[model samples]
Target: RFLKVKNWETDVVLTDTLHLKSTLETGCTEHICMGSIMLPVRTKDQLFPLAKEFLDQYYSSIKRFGSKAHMDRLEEVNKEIESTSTYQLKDTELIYGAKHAWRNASRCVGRIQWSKLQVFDARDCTTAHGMFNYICNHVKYATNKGNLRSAITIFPQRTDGKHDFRVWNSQLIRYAGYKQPDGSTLGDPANVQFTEICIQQGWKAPRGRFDVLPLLLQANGNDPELFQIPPELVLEVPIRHPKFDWFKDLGLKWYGLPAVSNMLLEIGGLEFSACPFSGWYMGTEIGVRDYCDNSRYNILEEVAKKMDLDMRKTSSLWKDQALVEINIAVLYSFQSDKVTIVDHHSATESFIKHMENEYRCRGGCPADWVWIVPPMSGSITPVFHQEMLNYRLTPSFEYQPDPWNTHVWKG
Candidate 1:
């Protein structure tokens, strides 16, 4: 009954109404039946209040900083909002919002350089072709000949203030996973479901475990349209060790940047479901999480065997040793390739420096302890002991559910 309201995706639901629903209280007379009013707040209406508040503050900040006549165009925007019940932001507004969205992202450890993000404004684009080009552009630009630059591409907002455009893939670049009958996946198990979806959408999953899948795009719907990214456009480094000659035979490589798709970009009060963003990978994210995780590469045991380490005994710290070595190889390999990479220790140190600078500027540096520390060597880093709190900050990015469940990944 509430869904028919068509105001918002998630709705207000409460069975126990306090204060107003008392059987004996004189202020609230209740019987077997309860009376209530379902005030419908449309999709656009939900953002009206927050939009007005944000816009009002934005304009006031302009005037307060000795720019009394500056940003006068905001008034015109405000007038349009008041009349049309929709917000039409100019290019500057979108770019500014995109940059701050990264800054306010509570989970991002690299927020200190938020202003350095390259914002690609595609709000004028309303088709799937537009989404494809913009997404590819973001991925390629972020690669930057292996010196990765963070970027976020903005897409058109839905007229109803709902999610309208989206990239179906988890990221612009991802490995294709083909599940065998024995239950083991050939490639990155993390992408098995997405790979199956792409196949159903006319993509031919490659036999290689590291085969890249083209971008699956959908505008206003889930009907897939694949856009193949040129191989030469992406920069990846061959995985190798400084000491181990056998490591190169392992056939491992990874892209320079981690461009996350299938996430929402919330700015002010509007949500961009199609926004794809990128950041350079911390060595451990690729080495420890992507390559070492049991569900994905599960390469720890393989590495242990190669190094001739005792795999049976927990006291030997075989897994720990493998994790460290893998991370070392990742960092070493990237540096050798002249690609941008940061060691776990250095990454944390840089973040702490960022925290100190932010603390000096804003009096408090918001950090997520879980995300701020390295996947391996956590206790050794300063962020491991750092006390942190998570809160809702607007103009941010967030994870979301998949576009479609094309197939069930083997349990």
Candidate 2:
């Protein structure tokens, strides 16, 4: 498959999580990983286009007041790397590449501030322990004591026979799920497969919902190892309803941070799969999708019943009303807990402003129509009227092979 497009409601503002909530992003080929293949000439063939794109943007930006010589320098960087199949990028180039990747991302609604992403270059790190430390630091920094920060920690790039670092979790913070004897799950159902893998690797997952999973790390031909997140470093907000006290008894909770660790950051022909990045949450990520989607926690019906809505009729809009209340609970609880999260209404408005600004500044900002629009009360937001187009762009974020399933990575 060239792209893994999810329903916008799920992870659109998005997991391990968003910085401010208002983004959904995707891409493609030539051994392309929308969400990888080791085909012929995988290294050199792939790197050139990305390098070319980055150089074009870089040169175009500085108003360098130079002509052919500057362009030739960019070509030399690409040509030399493709010829030898080994490359180096100045730190500034790496930084620019990351920012551009976010800018080029058509699916992200939050690209309005792509320049603000805090990047930590960990390309020199070559050990599993090094990855763990960097991630711990990253989580603490991103969490920022409830004021979340959008940041990414990039690991060493790949070449031949080198230890390639990989982070095994989707986010630095995620809940664990355990199987119950009654054939139901006790936590985030989305994590069941991963939870099983963690247990098989000798991880002792507590039998409950909302248990934070361990950080799985690997380096240089080693089986991945699990490390516990310091409890203090992991911030969780206890969920409660604003008006219904009984709703608090449901005991739903989520982590303060959502740093996605699984995707590879490809820039100028180098891939950093271990890079874990995050933005803050939009309320729907917790209220609508995470809590209500059938594939996830699937709590809408119960909520509707508690709200005393007629469950038997779709026209009653019980699900709709329930969704609203659940979101209200999420927004209220997060605010009550003093964690940073955006409501869908404000987030969409912010993104609409982001769109107009992008048009003024960038000429044409590519976006996916379905993805750019919010899931709840979408038509009310201006993004609903803005037509969008999506294609392929490079120096981009791409999903790599699941590190756990691959032979090269062992538990």
Candidate 3:
């Protein structure tokens, strides 16, 4: 009777009091669980404790616990905070914490390479114009001519919980989705709302299936400015199948870099609202979600028809067969263009090793099983079989309120 239960989401049983206690703290109540909800911004008073804890963890990371430099730096930060009301992260601290943020990403299956993340410190950037330049440079560097690299560009942190640097776009590179006159979407349906915002901000709408959306960058609490990303900087892979020559005629293509722009990076109680991070794609992200999902491109039926699968029969497995080909096309196209990508099998295998490494070092690797498993091969993948615990970790990336939702129109 003491909170013993089995979760349908994972193949695990909750038998311990500590497990029950952990669940209660995850923004849950008797009425419902708000585990996925974004947390409210911390007040000034709540920040110091977080900073102290992060600093302790940071110092311990370098095996310099209670060392003169460690102790002195903590005191220096406190003194600095006393004067300016906010502490600054040292160059080394920023670099180390950025990698730790990646390591703590529960949703990602590619945490094995977290230490290789390149940190671009842009805390000194002041204007939207500067944010535009820094982002364009980030896209160029991370793209690396299709051999994608993991990197993040940290913009200025929230000043007095006021002047936040924010990227309005969810991703640094995303295709525009136009609501056509006939009530159909033109491009990536996920981007329709942001595309409308861009047009409202005076960006000329391009009536193309894969038109890249411009950046809506906000800096120092000012109105967001639209900046057109240079076309040459974006690397796109044209989808074509190895077997089916007709796949080339589908005119399907996707951007090379998956750079998430809107998430906030929290390190030592400091929140950078516009830290955009990029990494190479796992094939299923484009094939299963982007192309096959009904709200997205919705190409499954067309693909199934081309594959000569019987749509009339549920047992025909038309959708399943089409999905495999689509994933094959995505992987083949990226490979042909020398783009960096990982298939689900290899990605999961690496994740298993990463989990082992994390558990050996830290006793637990927080993971969201729903996200870690490939969208297609659920039971076939190793991650699907493995039980995982999900939890929030500091020095992490977090979703922040949309700039528009929190905007105070000063006019």
Candidate 4:
């Protein structure tokens, strides 16, 4: 059953990739470099194909759903504007005009395009949001190189009410910059640089107030300053496999092994733990007398006896109840030992402590327990490591478990 599901997922990825590649090759205009600062080090040749595939698949799905009415309308408006005096309009001007046209069309449809924007609007909004999210994630993940802590501060409001411009500041101590009076810019004051400028002295400025921005701002407004605009520098970081060649250096720095090796170990640990018999045994079982009985004590006693003899000898004793119990205990002990060996490991007193520390250090939460397997030379297994890794890498503000509301477990 697991293999079947895995194979199906693999097929979907392959299908999506094929569609993306086709879209890029045929549908996408000449590749436009967005001029991102923290760019993923992918060669144009390599990225183009992958990007094209993803875009093609996405566009094709949109077309299939007949959700291109707004897009078609935007194109029509562009043609109309071009046929008129708007022929001299630049790409930015044309995009702006198209957006207004979209807004008008939304009114005609008796609906607001709050979530559903035209491709152009969607693209711009996505870029801005992506850059902000990337910066926050980067700051969360980057290791401290001594006392200098990497930080991200977003200036959510426009400095001048007339000009709607918000700034995202990712300050590195090594970067050459001087503090400005209004805290609007950071650089040489005399230069009066528009991008990073020196504010005049005695200017009142907002400080360390993230809450004010959201409360004061209104969505879907013509007030240009209210809407988030794409920053001059984009902070997109690609999600890549640990085994990928580019990450080889990073892997060694974080773990004692290569990135691939670290991934394998983590994945192996996950796989071992996921197996039903790999950990502890709880609950009741059937006896020969057609009676249900709990044999947990018997199992633990047998395991104790085996461990009293040769501890290592009981490692693979899963089939026998006594050996299973001993193996679980041994694995738990091993986890404790591994945690002790790691310098930054915190002794968690409770689940809350474990979760809090994990979030602060690893940008993720650890599972309830670790898994250990009887050391086998070579074998492959299914694991949910990728899913767990994904969960950790992304920020999750809230999580709610599915409520088992039924009375099935009550008895």
Instruction: Count clashes in each candidate, considering only residues at least 3 apart in sequence or on different chains.
Output: 0, 11, 0, 4
Clashes of 1: 0
For all candidates in order, the CA lDDT equals 0.71, 0.75, 0.85, 0.22
lDDT of 4 at 254: 9
Q: Give one digit per residue, the lDDT tens place, for model 4 in 204-310.
A: 22332111111011112121111221222212111122223332222111010000000000010011000000001111110100011121112333333433534
271-368, model 2: which lDDT tens digit per residue?
77677888888888888889999888989988888889999989999999999899899999989988999887777777766755665565545666
Q: What would you estimate as the lDDT of candidate 2?
A: 0.75
- Candidate 3 lDDT, 63-104, residue by residue in tens: 998899988988888777767778889989999989988988
lDDT of 1 at 136: 71
The total of clashing pairs for model 4 equals 4
Clash list (residue pairs), candidate 4: 20-52, 20-53, 20-54, 21-53
TM-score of candidate 2 to 2 decimals:
0.85
Evaluate residue 352 in candidate 3 and report its C-alpha lDDT on the 0 to 100 scale.
Answer: 80
Question: Ten residues in a row with the worst lDDT in model 4?
Answer: 257-266
lDDT of 1 at 400: 60
Off by over 4 Å in 1: 1-44, 56-75, 161-163, 405-411
Following a full C-alpha superposition, what root-mean-square deviation does model 1 have from the true structure? 11.1
